[PDB]
Amino acid sequence: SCAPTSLPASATELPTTVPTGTVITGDYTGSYRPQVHYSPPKGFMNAPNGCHRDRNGTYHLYYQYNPLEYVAGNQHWGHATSDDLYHWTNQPIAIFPPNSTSQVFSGSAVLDPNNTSGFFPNTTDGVVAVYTLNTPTLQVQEVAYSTDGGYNFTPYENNPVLSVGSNQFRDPKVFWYEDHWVMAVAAANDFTIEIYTSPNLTSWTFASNFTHHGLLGLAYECPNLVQVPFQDDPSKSAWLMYISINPGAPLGGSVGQYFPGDFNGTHFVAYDSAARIADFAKDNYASQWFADTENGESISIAWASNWQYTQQVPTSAQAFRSAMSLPRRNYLTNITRLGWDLVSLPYDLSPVVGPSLLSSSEANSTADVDFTNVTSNAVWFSLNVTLPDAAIQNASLISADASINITFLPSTKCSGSDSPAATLTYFYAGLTNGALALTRPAASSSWGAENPFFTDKFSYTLVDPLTSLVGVFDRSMLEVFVNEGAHSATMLVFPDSPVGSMKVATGGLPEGTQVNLQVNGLESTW
Amino acid sequence: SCAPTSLPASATELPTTVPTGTVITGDYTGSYRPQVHYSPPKGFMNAPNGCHRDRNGTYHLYYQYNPLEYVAGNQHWGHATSDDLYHWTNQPIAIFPPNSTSQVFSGSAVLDPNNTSGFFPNTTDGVVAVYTLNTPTLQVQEVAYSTDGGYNFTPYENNPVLSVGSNQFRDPKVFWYEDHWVMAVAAANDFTIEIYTSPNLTSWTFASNFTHHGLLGLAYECPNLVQVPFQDDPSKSAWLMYISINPGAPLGGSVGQYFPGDFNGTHFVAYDSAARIADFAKDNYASQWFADTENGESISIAWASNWQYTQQVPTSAQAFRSAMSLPRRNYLTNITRLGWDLVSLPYDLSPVVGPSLLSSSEANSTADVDFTNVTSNAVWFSLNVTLPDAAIQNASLISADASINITFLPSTKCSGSDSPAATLTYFYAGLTNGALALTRPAASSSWGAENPFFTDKFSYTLVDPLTSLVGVFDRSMLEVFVNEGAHSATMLVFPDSPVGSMKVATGGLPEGTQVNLQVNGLESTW
Ligand SMILES: *[C@@H]1O[C@H](CO)[C@@H](O[C@@H]2O[C@H](CO)[C@@H](O[C@@H]3O[C@H](CO)[C@@H](O)[C@H](O[C@H]4O[C@H](CO)[C@@H](O)[C@H](O)[C@@H]4O)[C@@H]3O)[C@H](O)[C@H]2NC(C)=O)[C@H](O)[C@H]1NC(C)=O
Ligand SMILES: *[C@@H]1O[C@H](CO)[C@@H](O[C@@H]2O[C@H](CO)[C@@H](O[C@@H]3O[C@H](CO)[C@@H](O)[C@H](O)[C@@H]3O)[C@H](O)[C@H]2NC(C)=O)[C@H](O)[C@H]1NC(C)=O
Ligand SMILES: *[C@@H]1O[C@H](CO)[C@@H](O[C@@H]2O[C@H](CO)[C@@H](O)[C@H](O)[C@H]2NC(C)=O)[C@H](O)[C@H]1NC(C)=O
Ligand SMILES: *[C@@H]1O[C@H](CO)[C@@H](O)[C@H](O)[C@H]1NC(C)=O
Ligand SMILES: *[C@@H]1O[C@H](CO)[C@@H](O)[C@H](O)[C@H]1NC(C)=O
Ligand SMILES: *[C@@H]1O[C@H](CO)[C@@H](O)[C@H](O)[C@H]1NC(C)=O
Ligand SMILES: *[C@@H]1O[C@H](CO)[C@@H](O)[C@H](O)[C@H]1NC(C)=O
Ligand SMILES: *[C@@H]1O[C@H](CO)[C@@H](O)[C@H](O)[C@H]1NC(C)=O
Ligand SMILES: *[C@@H]1O[C@H](CO)[C@@H](O)[C@H](O)[C@H]1NC(C)=O
Ligand SMILES: *[C@@H]1O[C@H](CO)[C@@H](O)[C@H](O)[C@H]1NC(C)=O
Ligand SMILES: *[C@@H]1O[C@H](CO)[C@@H](O)[C@H](O)[C@H]1NC(C)=O
Ligand SMILES: *[C@@H]1O[C@H](CO)[C@@H](O)[C@H](O)[C@H]1NC(C)=O
Ligand SMILES: *[C@@H]1O[C@H](CO)[C@@H](O)[C@H](O)[C@H]1NC(C)=O
Ligand SMILES: *[C@@H]1O[C@H](CO)[C@@H](O)[C@H](O)[C@H]1NC(C)=O
Ligand SMILES: *[C@@H]1O[C@H](CO)[C@@H](O)[C@H](O)[C@H]1NC(C)=O
Ligand SMILES: *[C@@H]1O[C@H](CO)[C@@H](O)[C@H](O)[C@H]1NC(C)=O
Ligand SMILES: *[C@@H]1O[C@H](CO)[C@@H](O)[C@H](O)[C@H]1NC(C)=O
Ligand SMILES: *[C@@H]1O[C@H](CO)[C@@H](O)[C@H](O)[C@H]1NC(C)=O
Ligand SMILES: OC[C@H]1O[C@](O)(CO)[C@@H](O)[C@@H]1O
Ligand SMILES: OC[C@H]1O[C@](O)(CO)[C@@H](O)[C@@H]1O
Ligand SMILES: *[C@H]1O[C@H](CO)[C@@H](O)[C@H](O)[C@@H]1O
Ligand SMILES: *[C@H]1O[C@H](CO)[C@@H](O)[C@H](O)[C@@H]1O
Ligand SMILES: *[C@H]1O[C@H](CO)[C@@H](O)[C@H](O)[C@@H]1O
Ligand SMILES: *[C@H]1O[C@H](CO)[C@@H](O)[C@H](O)[C@@H]1O
Ligand SMILES: *[C@H]1O[C@H](CO)[C@@H](O)[C@H](O)[C@@H]1O
């Protein structure tokens, strides 16, 4: 059986009224439907919201959700739960607008076990959502509380809790700092993150502004102010302001950027005036960090799309638009020359890793790996390359031809051009030394070639040699992680024919180079 | 009849020894050879150097030049002169390395009419070049002087004039401030522009550092610190620090960025912590400003290429690699919401503008313009759109379909895919409101499709409606300028078949919208 390219009418037909108190049933069998990423059972999804872990260890993912269309609008908070951030259970819609002319825009959630809010006289498991209500004339911050573990929310009786009389004032991210609540919120079209403080989540006082930092684009969105541990030393950490911008990103549309710095409970001060882009492709946006994580883990998830084409991608015939990124483990590190770097790695994938397709220690060879018998149409790969120390001390010893080439090739079973669906090319030396290209050839996709914003080629240039590469392919998405997650990219692909194999080639590698390649099929979560 | 795709052996064969005191003869007839842009007669060119206007109105363009190969190396300063920045005369090589193991890297030139240097006891027309000398172990700043108008240079007897014992210290840009010389120079791998002062161009004193601003990439290069007049008010100006970075640009490889701010003769202070990219495509790098211009004119030129593919472009069979951008008139303006903006417009094109190919006032139409009779294979176009007052006040009145689509189509006489060589698509509203796409379809170019770094699609998103668009096509290059040069892009194209025509379509425009389209052929300067 080939995965279907179109579904039954009952799978794709959207209701004319929003379902309340019942799970929306999903057909997750589409040829483009990711099997280890979250996507909504039906309809259009964007930013992750309300991300938190409850005391029982359940991760709550909420999401911007149009239950009525395959385009942006009518925003509700959708809800899915998981104990491992891969095996998702769909839940009833969590937050509804008060009427048909208002929308529940992005926001965050916190546990209030000490009842600072006063909402929780008889429970230590209270959840508070802080979110933007979009009116035709205003964006205001509102509060809603849950006594049932974050499934049903009661709006605060004296909403809204915060307004500045603006229709560009959104995406509150709330967290506890020592003795008070902090809110980071975007004065979106003023390129300002405003910081407010509160003892009880309902009374907010202005603290400070963070304005005109890094790339402006056309708006600041979905600010996250978080403490991120050092990759090489868990006992150390720094504060990080993460800001999403859209439109006006360098590659077009939407992108995330970050600022390492100091936070003292009222003011964030960046360590320098540099701009730093989080992902070197164009399908990673609106990253939100999970509240109430265990063991000083920095855990985030993003929307794996771009505002320039998210409402036009050819998945609506498969009963959805938009998926989340892999869930991410985050660290800070210093990389050679550039210094500060936001590290992103896939959150523990062990619960979805299936049997080995290939284990190889062959250097200067091509490994040809078929996965047509992997029903998920999803694979994980790991490539380690360890140069001899002679080639580290003297890079002039490396051949101009020393390179890595990865290609994802169309299925022989589920066919059509022979073009790869996705390529990665890296050079150790030569005229483009350290250059890594990630491509989705226009030739592989009639839709992609025609969409004016669907960029074919992305690149990042290393200073250090490439020593590790991890990747996940999941039907219509490729994520890559270079040098223990120092550099990462999230890339959508919509090939005319589904991918059925991958080739991993190394060439021109120095004598004594160690190569280790591992490829595993992934098990579907649905 | 058709422009040659391959030239005689004598046209492309490079000498084995560098010619001294003689002009290198060029064949400028190649199907990819620009006819209104500067490119070297033979060999490989990169960054513009020594840019200045002499007292008699001759513009001097020097350039990084490998006379021996079609790749980077063996750097000399090549030299060309013009009175209008379009009609270039090739000159003998201006600056030579002192031996076979050193290279003349980038730098600047200034007039020294008051003989501050002591080089010019008997002339007020003295020119001083300040440039990086590259050795395998060091980058140092050197001085050479010319008494003959900048054709022949004598090295300063006590070179070098500035060393810090670094191998990453280059691209000095020198200018007069009130009572002293200022040098902006890149501590390239430290992401620092160092400012030095001198009474006499030979003795340099450290003044200040400008460090870790905007995008770092992998290196700061070719800093320019210049006073740029306001577009709306010639009597006002602000200081601007322009920095080129490579590699590590968001689109891959090389890009220019800028910082508006204050300069007081010793210290540059940016007005804010924002990063601002100069050009929204990937083929505009190492912009240098002309010294000693007239009438408060800010004039610059850039290298129209990208380091990721400049040494691989398919023009070596046509006796060259690399062209300059159009010469640019620069201003600063405030654009809606985003604020500070570097304006770039083509410098007075009137000396190359040939007869009209089309004048049209038709809205909601497709104009087909054939230019197979324009021997230059170069055209200028101008498109104005004036929306009615009603739609300027209420944009909700604009149709989702309101759009402008320009395509450059392959010649049928000199061919074959029917793919456009280049496209521009802009939307007034709909789901991607204000989004402008500039594309070079992979389908149009076998070389382009295969090159892993030759990105197919670029975009910029407007806030204001598009009201003006100017463009120049020149055989293998397209430059576009949006809303009186508020936004600009430089894009190389290497189509399999030469461009023979363009289509300009408007559609879905509000009742009462005024459209004016002008297209002119350009006259070859060679
Ligand atoms: C913390 O930051 C917030 C967000 O930036 C800030 O609130 C804002 O203040 C600015 C003023 O600095 C407001 O901007 C103005 O809004 C009015 C109404 O639309 C405009 O008429 C003003 O126009 C003039 O000034 C502009 C900027 O120089 C010019 O471009 C223009 O031509 C006019 O001369 C101006 O745009 C803005 O509306 C608010 N935004 C919000 C969301 O409140 C707040 O003041 C900061 N607080 C502290 C303590 O610093
Ligand atoms: C102005 O900026 C320049 C350039 O950044 C400063 O010089 C530089 O100083 C740094 C130290 O901050 C040097 O880094 C160092 O590298 C050497 C060798 O790798 C190492 O031994 C040192 O311990 C240090 O890590 C850098 O090399 C150097 N660069 C250059 C081009 O000289 C300068 O100090 C600044 N001046 C002021 C007043 O701030
Ligand atoms: C762009 O707008 C800014 C902010 O309005 C201008 O900067 C100021 O200009 C006024 C004079 O009109 C000065 O008094 C202020 O001190 C300036 N700075 C600030 C932060 O307000 C700037 O001049 C404008 N630039 C252009 C090119 O128009
Ligand atoms: C809909 O709800 C919004 C937000 O509470 C409010 O501003 C608006 O007046 C409501 N309209 C109606 C008629 O219910
Ligand atoms: C929250 O605290 C503020 C003081 O910051 C107080 O004015 C307000 O009454 C409190 N609200 C509730 C509902 O307890
Ligand atoms: C935090 O730092 C700022 C200066 O950046 C200072 O003004 C403020 O008072 C500090 N707040 C606390 C709680 O110390
Ligand atoms: C990066 O280096 C800087 C300068 O030494 C240091 O202050 C910072 O703690 C380092 N960060 C990490 C993550 O190692
Ligand atoms: C499935 O495919 C893999 C990779 O080609 C192969 O190693 C494995 O033996 C196959 N298994 C079956 C049961 O076909
Ligand atoms: C690398 O080897 C070359 C000779 O092959 C030598 O000239 C050079 O100095 C060496 N470089 C280093 C970093 O040791
Ligand atoms: C590859 O190197 C990584 C470091 O990024 C390490 O965690 C992993 O165990 C190695 N994989 C193997 C041995 O193939
Ligand atoms: C990888 O592909 C590139 C194409 O740019 C090629 O130049 C390089 O030699 C190849 N390396 C391999 C097959 O390992
Ligand atoms: C890989 O090829 C390079 C360059 O030809 C060579 O020096 C090296 O010994 C080769 N290694 C293997 C494992 O064949
Ligand atoms: C070559 O010339 C440069 C610049 O004058 C000088 O620094 C270098 O030492 C010279 N090398 C030799 C081998 O003559
Ligand atoms: C340049 O000026 C410095 C400082 O006054 C002085 O030491 C030096 O002799 C001058 N050099 C020349 C060649 O005039
Ligand atoms: C220039 O400005 C800096 C502050 O940015 C100051 O330290 C210096 O004294 C000023 N120099 C002059 C010549 O005024
Ligand atoms: C467009 O408008 C400008 C306004 O200055 C005018 O100079 C120019 O002639 C017009 N260009 C076209 C499209 O005719
Ligand atoms: C331009 O192209 C877009 C699709 O990219 C299309 O929707 C629009 O209707 C076209 N408009 C014109 C003016 O041809
Ligand atoms: C353009 O076409 C639209 C849709 O048919 C129409 O409403 C509008 O009046 C037309 N405008 C002009 C300027 O012809
Ligand atoms: O994509 C992020 C942006 O879109 C929204 O989520 C609305 O669905 C906003 O709250 C946010 O600024
Ligand atoms: O392209 C810019 C860079 O390349 C050089 O011009 C050398 O040819 C350097 O001077 C500069 O940093
Ligand atoms: C969906 O699309 C595939 C090919 O893309 C067809 O094979 C299938 O029948 C359906 O139309
Ligand atoms: C659900 O959506 C699909 C794709 O548009 C339709 O083909 C189907 O009939 C139903 O409307
Ligand atoms: C369940 O109730 C909610 C209340 O907001 C409605 O929006 C929904 O349509 C359904 O009736
Ligand atoms: C330019 O091309 C000619 C052939 O036309 C060669 O002979 C020459 O060496 C250079 O490559
Ligand atoms: C003319 O002289 C220069 C040195 O000034 C040489 O490099 C060139 O080859 C020719 O002899």
Short mmCIF file of C-alpha atoms in Angstrom, two decimals, chain A residues 50-298:
data_model
loop_
_atom_site.label_atom_id
_atom_site.label_comp_id
_atom_site.label_asym_id
_atom_site.label_seq_id
_atom_site.Cartn_x
_atom_site.Cartn_y
_atom_site.Cartn_z
CA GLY A 50 0.56 27.35 26.66
CA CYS A 51 3.52 24.89 26.54
CA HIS A 52 4.06 23.36 30.03
CA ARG A 53 4.69 20.05 31.87
CA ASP A 54 2.20 19.15 34.67
CA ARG A 55 3.34 17.59 38.03
CA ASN A 56 2.36 14.09 36.67
CA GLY A 57 4.92 14.50 33.79
CA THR A 58 2.33 15.15 31.00
CA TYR A 59 3.52 17.73 28.41
CA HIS A 60 0.65 20.05 27.31
CA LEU A 61 0.98 21.50 23.76
CA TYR A 62 -1.62 24.17 22.88
CA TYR A 63 -1.64 25.71 19.40
CA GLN A 64 -3.18 28.53 17.32
CA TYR A 65 -6.05 26.69 15.58
CA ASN A 66 -8.63 27.51 12.88
CA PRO A 67 -11.12 24.60 13.26
CA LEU A 68 -13.29 25.98 10.35
CA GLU A 69 -10.75 26.51 7.46
CA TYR A 70 -7.35 25.41 6.00
CA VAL A 71 -6.14 29.08 6.31
CA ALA A 72 -5.42 31.46 9.25
CA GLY A 73 -8.47 32.80 11.19
CA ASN A 74 -11.08 32.10 13.91
CA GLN A 75 -8.15 31.41 16.28
CA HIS A 76 -8.78 28.96 19.18
CA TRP A 77 -6.22 27.17 21.40
CA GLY A 78 -6.10 23.52 20.26
CA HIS A 79 -4.74 21.01 22.81
CA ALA A 80 -2.64 17.79 22.58
CA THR A 81 -0.88 15.87 25.41
CA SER A 82 2.19 13.55 25.50
CA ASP A 83 4.53 12.07 28.19
CA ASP A 84 7.46 11.95 25.66
CA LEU A 85 6.79 14.88 23.18
CA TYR A 86 6.29 12.33 20.30
CA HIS A 87 3.19 10.18 21.16
CA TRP A 88 0.46 12.89 21.04
CA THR A 89 -3.19 12.43 22.11
CA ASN A 90 -5.60 15.05 20.66
CA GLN A 91 -7.81 16.78 23.28
CA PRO A 92 -10.92 18.98 23.01
CA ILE A 93 -10.29 22.69 22.14
CA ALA A 94 -9.00 24.34 25.39
CA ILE A 95 -9.67 28.13 24.89
CA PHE A 96 -12.55 29.66 22.85
CA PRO A 97 -13.06 33.32 21.88
CA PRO A 98 -16.11 34.92 23.59
CA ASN A 99 -17.89 35.34 20.18
CA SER A 100 -17.45 35.05 16.36
CA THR A 101 -15.81 38.55 15.94
CA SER A 102 -12.85 37.92 18.36
CA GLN A 103 -9.85 35.47 18.31
CA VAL A 104 -7.63 33.76 20.96
CA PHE A 105 -4.10 34.76 19.77
CA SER A 106 -0.81 33.39 21.20
CA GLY A 107 0.13 33.12 24.89
CA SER A 108 1.71 30.97 27.59
CA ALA A 109 0.71 28.90 30.66
CA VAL A 110 2.22 28.48 34.16
CA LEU A 111 1.52 26.15 37.12
CA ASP A 112 0.38 28.17 40.22
CA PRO A 113 0.84 25.50 42.95
CA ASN A 114 1.05 28.21 45.72
CA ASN A 115 -2.25 29.90 44.58
CA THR A 116 -0.61 33.36 44.07
CA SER A 117 -3.59 34.01 41.67
CA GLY A 118 -6.30 33.21 44.29
CA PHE A 119 -7.99 30.92 41.65
CA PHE A 120 -6.95 27.66 43.44
CA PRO A 121 -8.12 27.59 47.12
CA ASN A 122 -8.43 23.71 47.09
CA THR A 123 -5.72 22.51 44.57
CA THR A 124 -1.90 22.73 44.06
CA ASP A 125 -2.33 21.65 40.36
CA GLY A 126 -3.87 24.96 39.10
CA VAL A 127 -2.87 26.10 35.54
CA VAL A 128 -3.13 29.78 34.42
CA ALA A 129 -3.22 30.70 30.70
CA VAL A 130 -2.13 34.27 29.80
CA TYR A 131 -3.01 35.06 26.16
CA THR A 132 -3.82 37.86 23.69
CA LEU A 133 -7.51 38.49 22.88
CA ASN A 134 -7.75 39.99 19.36
CA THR A 135 -10.75 42.39 18.94
CA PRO A 136 -11.47 44.27 15.65
CA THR A 137 -9.83 47.41 17.25
CA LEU A 138 -7.51 46.08 20.07
CA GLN A 139 -5.07 43.41 21.26
CA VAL A 140 -5.31 42.93 25.08
CA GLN A 141 -3.86 40.36 27.53
CA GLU A 142 -6.37 38.05 29.27
CA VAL A 143 -6.15 35.32 31.95
CA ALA A 144 -8.00 31.96 32.14
CA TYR A 145 -7.55 29.24 34.82
CA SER A 146 -7.97 25.41 34.88
CA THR A 147 -8.61 23.22 37.99
CA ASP A 148 -8.78 19.97 35.88
CA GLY A 149 -5.09 19.84 34.70
CA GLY A 150 -5.41 22.27 31.73
CA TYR A 151 -8.28 20.68 29.66
CA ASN A 152 -11.05 23.22 30.56
CA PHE A 153 -10.36 26.95 31.22
CA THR A 154 -12.56 29.56 32.99
CA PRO A 155 -11.96 33.17 31.84
CA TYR A 156 -10.96 35.57 34.69
CA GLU A 157 -14.09 37.61 35.67
CA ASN A 158 -12.23 41.02 35.45
CA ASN A 159 -10.47 40.48 32.04
CA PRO A 160 -8.65 42.03 30.38
CA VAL A 161 -5.65 42.24 32.81
CA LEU A 162 -3.39 44.43 30.55
CA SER A 163 -3.92 46.89 27.63
CA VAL A 164 -1.93 49.87 26.21
CA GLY A 165 -4.80 50.86 23.83
CA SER A 166 -3.02 49.24 20.81
CA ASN A 167 -4.01 46.70 18.09
CA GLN A 168 -0.30 45.58 17.99
CA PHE A 169 0.34 44.23 21.53
CA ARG A 170 0.49 40.42 21.77
CA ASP A 171 2.04 37.05 22.68
CA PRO A 172 2.60 37.23 26.49
CA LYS A 173 5.21 34.76 27.85
CA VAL A 174 4.90 34.51 31.67
CA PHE A 175 7.32 32.86 34.16
CA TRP A 176 8.22 33.01 37.90
CA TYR A 177 11.38 34.98 38.89
CA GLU A 178 12.22 34.40 42.62
CA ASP A 179 9.34 36.39 44.26
CA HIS A 180 7.17 37.62 41.30
CA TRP A 181 5.67 36.78 37.88
CA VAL A 182 7.33 38.29 34.76
CA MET A 183 5.56 38.86 31.41
CA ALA A 184 7.47 39.42 28.13
CA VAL A 185 4.97 40.79 25.53
CA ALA A 186 5.48 42.28 22.01
CA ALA A 187 4.64 45.87 21.07
CA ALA A 188 4.85 44.16 17.68
CA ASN A 189 5.01 47.10 15.17
CA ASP A 190 7.19 49.24 17.56
CA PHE A 191 9.94 46.48 17.61
CA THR A 192 9.75 46.49 21.45
CA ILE A 193 9.46 43.63 23.96
CA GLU A 194 7.76 45.11 27.06
CA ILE A 195 8.47 43.45 30.46
CA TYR A 196 5.73 43.62 33.17
CA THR A 197 5.72 42.15 36.73
CA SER A 198 2.85 40.80 38.92
CA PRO A 199 2.45 39.19 42.37
CA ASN A 200 -0.81 37.38 41.32
CA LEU A 201 -0.99 37.20 37.42
CA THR A 202 -3.96 39.73 37.25
CA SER A 203 -2.30 43.03 38.41
CA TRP A 204 0.57 43.96 36.00
CA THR A 205 3.14 46.80 36.47
CA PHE A 206 5.47 48.06 33.67
CA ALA A 207 9.16 47.16 34.35
CA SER A 208 11.25 47.81 31.16
CA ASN A 209 11.47 47.99 27.33
CA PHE A 210 13.83 46.03 25.00
CA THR A 211 13.64 47.93 21.65
CA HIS A 212 15.22 47.96 18.12
CA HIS A 213 17.55 44.93 18.69
CA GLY A 214 18.80 42.61 15.90
CA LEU A 215 16.74 42.27 12.68
CA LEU A 216 13.49 44.34 12.81
CA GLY A 217 11.61 42.66 9.92
CA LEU A 218 8.02 44.09 9.92
CA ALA A 219 7.07 43.04 13.53
CA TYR A 220 8.35 41.45 16.77
CA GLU A 221 6.27 38.36 17.76
CA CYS A 222 6.21 35.47 20.32
CA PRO A 223 8.98 36.73 22.65
CA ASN A 224 10.50 34.09 24.99
CA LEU A 225 12.76 35.16 27.91
CA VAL A 226 14.40 31.96 29.22
CA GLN A 227 17.40 30.63 31.19
CA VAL A 228 19.40 28.26 28.92
CA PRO A 229 22.14 25.97 30.31
CA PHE A 230 25.65 25.73 28.75
CA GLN A 231 26.07 22.56 26.59
CA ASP A 232 29.53 21.71 28.10
CA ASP A 233 28.63 22.66 31.76
CA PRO A 234 25.08 22.07 33.14
CA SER A 235 25.89 24.16 36.31
CA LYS A 236 26.21 27.35 34.15
CA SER A 237 23.43 29.18 32.22
CA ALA A 238 22.61 32.57 30.65
CA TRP A 239 19.35 34.42 29.92
CA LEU A 240 18.19 34.46 26.29
CA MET A 241 15.60 36.72 24.64
CA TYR A 242 14.15 34.81 21.62
CA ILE A 243 12.08 36.96 19.18
CA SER A 244 10.15 35.81 16.07
CA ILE A 245 9.89 38.39 13.20
CA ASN A 246 7.38 38.39 10.31
CA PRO A 247 7.35 39.48 7.60
CA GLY A 248 10.75 40.96 6.53
CA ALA A 249 13.09 38.00 7.38
CA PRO A 250 16.24 37.88 5.17
CA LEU A 251 15.13 34.62 3.36
CA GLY A 252 11.59 36.11 3.11
CA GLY A 253 8.65 36.05 5.54
CA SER A 254 9.15 34.67 9.08
CA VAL A 255 12.30 33.76 11.11
CA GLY A 256 13.48 33.43 14.74
CA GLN A 257 16.44 35.33 16.28
CA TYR A 258 17.94 35.44 19.81
CA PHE A 259 20.01 37.62 22.17
CA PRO A 260 22.17 36.17 25.00
CA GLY A 261 22.22 38.43 28.06
CA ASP A 262 21.43 39.14 31.74
CA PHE A 263 17.96 39.29 33.39
CA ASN A 264 17.57 40.60 36.99
CA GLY A 265 13.73 40.27 37.37
CA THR A 266 12.88 43.68 35.74
CA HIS A 267 15.45 44.37 32.92
CA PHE A 268 17.00 42.23 30.15
CA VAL A 269 20.43 43.57 28.94
CA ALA A 270 21.97 41.86 25.86
CA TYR A 271 25.73 41.06 26.16
CA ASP A 272 26.37 42.83 22.77
CA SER A 273 24.61 44.54 19.79
CA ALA A 274 24.88 41.48 17.44
CA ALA A 275 21.94 39.86 15.58
CA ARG A 276 21.88 35.99 15.61
CA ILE A 277 19.49 33.86 13.43
CA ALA A 278 18.34 30.59 15.12
CA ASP A 279 17.80 28.37 11.99
CA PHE A 280 19.56 28.67 8.55
CA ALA A 281 16.46 27.61 6.47
CA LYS A 282 13.00 29.33 6.39
CA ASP A 283 10.52 26.81 8.04
CA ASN A 284 11.09 27.42 11.80
CA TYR A 285 8.96 30.10 13.55
CA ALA A 286 7.26 31.10 16.83
CA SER A 287 9.47 28.84 19.05
CA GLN A 288 7.93 28.58 22.56
CA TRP A 289 9.69 27.12 25.65
CA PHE A 290 7.87 24.62 27.95
CA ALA A 291 7.21 25.98 31.49
CA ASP A 292 7.87 23.77 34.58
CA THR A 293 10.43 21.37 32.94
CA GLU A 294 12.34 18.80 35.10
CA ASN A 295 16.13 18.85 35.81
CA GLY A 296 16.95 22.34 34.36
CA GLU A 297 16.06 21.02 30.84
CA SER A 298 15.50 23.80 28.24
#
